Amino acid sequence: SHRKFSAPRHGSLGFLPRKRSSRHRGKVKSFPKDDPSKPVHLTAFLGYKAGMTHIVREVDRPGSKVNKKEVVEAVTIVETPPMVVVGIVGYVETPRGLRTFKTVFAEHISDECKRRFYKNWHKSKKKAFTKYCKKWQDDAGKRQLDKDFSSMKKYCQVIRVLAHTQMRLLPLRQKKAHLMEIQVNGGTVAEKLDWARERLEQQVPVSQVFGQDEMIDVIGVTKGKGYKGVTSRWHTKKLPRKTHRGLRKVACIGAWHPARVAFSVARAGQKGYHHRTEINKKIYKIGQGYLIKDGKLIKNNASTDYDLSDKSINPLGGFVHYGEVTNDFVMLKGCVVGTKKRVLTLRKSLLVQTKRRALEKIDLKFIDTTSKFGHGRFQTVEEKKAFMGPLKKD
């Protein structure tokens, strides 16, 4: 007969292959649309999650109760060291899709990138791809280079560029680096290629890619949680107490006459470690690293206009499971995808953002230092000393 009482469906069929993702690093599927109007510029960027903290700002929106009141918000911290360009790669336009055409590397590839291509760096004799780097010092090579580049002048339509991250500047355990392709949008191919030819074997920081409080998208891989059931997975109800063969189940699987089982019934498997793509996270602040000038180091990162203390964005006793921050950082809004020490892929916005809340300009007032590692009750070191006093340990 019919179901007596109506109900909405549990879960979504849009994400149904809930499997362990075949890639750990995030993968950009959809780059933004170019036009020959604007000058050339990159689109995506690659960073590393560290932790979370408060913020306290003022709100400027007319037509609400919160106008001109000091609200608080919750942010993340994403450490973004400068990236290195190690090669270009073109693409052609076909009716069967979009075939790749030609790839041209640089002369002195660092050993951080010589790693990724290997598995067992200790046992290998480190023949680190040194016939191709005979093609940047001999005059039999710069012909085929000038004809490769004139081929990508003529026959190429989209030019992505090969960049790898920089691992010497991180407190992580590993020593291997992440390569990635990033698409350059701009004018014609002649301009785009003469721009990127110059940047070859260089550092590219964040601020020559982004700006401030532009709405961006975050592509990353979920925290993983093992082989969970169907209550923890699809979030259904539990059966009552008087049952016999368990109670965290789903009772009626399918109907009779469809002799199969439908593919939309909630079954038990893997949970987490998936690919996901969040949209419209807004940036509040782009800090700067520990730079040493005139002997000592200057670390007034978190010095706002109103606190104007010299404290940085490292809390007391370091971030948990990450370490300390010496490089720069972006400061997002809301939670993001991925556990700690997880690599994360940023991207500018697909959408023509024109509303009243994505045009709001942002002023901070007070960045917290909450040593989660225990309840916080201080902000920095010396105030804790000028408040407790002298100790027996001294």
Added chain:
Amino acid sequence: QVLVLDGRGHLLGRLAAIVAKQVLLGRKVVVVRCEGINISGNFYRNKLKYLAFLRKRMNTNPSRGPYHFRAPSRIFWRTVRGMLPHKTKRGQAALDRLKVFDGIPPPYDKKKRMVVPAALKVVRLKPTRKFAYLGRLAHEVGWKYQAVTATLEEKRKEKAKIHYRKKKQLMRLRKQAEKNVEKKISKFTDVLKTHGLLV
């Protein structure tokens, strides 16, 4: 030893009624440009005739369901697979002789293509009726590649205008040396007229 075919102006059932016999009789056929084919009947009836085929998916796991191809090639290959015994080793060893392309690839542009007259819209339709294209149909039903095909079918028409100009340029030179010489080939034509070659 290998046939070629155009796809403009030919019908869909009449072409596949010639081709599913000529394949089984041992003859490699390649049919190029299968987006200029047109279908009998008006447009919106063949679109509701096709979206009532797109609504038919196997219910419990559609990945096992009817693979709805959307290209005009894998539609013409669909409506040949129906005219063949595709369960047996004399069907599966015939479909690997047929080869269908969207647009026209470079291996088959510098070759003279043959044209079937028995399947043309101007012959097999009264001229007061309606016909419907297939390309604009596939674009309306989910084909993403007309903005590439239209310009790759523009760069070869521009290459063949040039090849027709240098075909005319050698032909005029041929008819002027054939005007200068015929003093000395006056005798090698009074032997051809009486055998019927230059009338």
Added chain:
Amino acid sequence: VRYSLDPENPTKSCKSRGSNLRVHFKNTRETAQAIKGMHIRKATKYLKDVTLKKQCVPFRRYNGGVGRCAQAKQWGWTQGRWPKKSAEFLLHMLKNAESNAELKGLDVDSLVIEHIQVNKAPKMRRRTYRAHGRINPYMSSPCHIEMILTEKE
């Protein structure tokens, strides 16, 4: 006695055979298929690294419910296990065969095993006790073994 497969030249071949051994039959079949073409100083190193869980023995046929291992990715197969008795009771056989390959007066350390064969055996009988006063049998499964070495340089 008369073995199944006749050797090529009994000058170069040493023989051995064990009757009515108490092991399983299937474990011993498979670990007596991984060994067929090796050298004797490799086989006596393998059958120890089977004991100490270094190299594994892949179950190809009798694989019901047998879990997988990573070390069997050498043999290009997923399901392996590390059986102990079936590697002891045909190592004490390669000491019998080596001593008779010395008594006949051949060269020991160039023997290539060419033939090994395991048969079924007469089943023993015990009994066990189930519900409602029923009795189910609890039989074993021993095996026969015979093998032919050969010097192949």
Added chain:
RNA sequence: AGAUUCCCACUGUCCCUACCUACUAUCCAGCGAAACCACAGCCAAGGGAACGGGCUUGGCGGAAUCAGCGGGGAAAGAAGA
């Protein structure tokens, strides 16, 4: 230790689900069974002893396997009480 209804105190029965622990299951060394089985195992419609795992017309199909799972096999039990 009988059957019905109402109010006080108390409560994870419930809104609405979470977390910890023990022995199990899971993988390994050892020992090691039975119930059952014509041949075997992907689906829609049609006819048909009027609801097929096989025939017909179509859709389609790629070894060998592990942990789960209860829709089906008009499942197993017992010559319908």
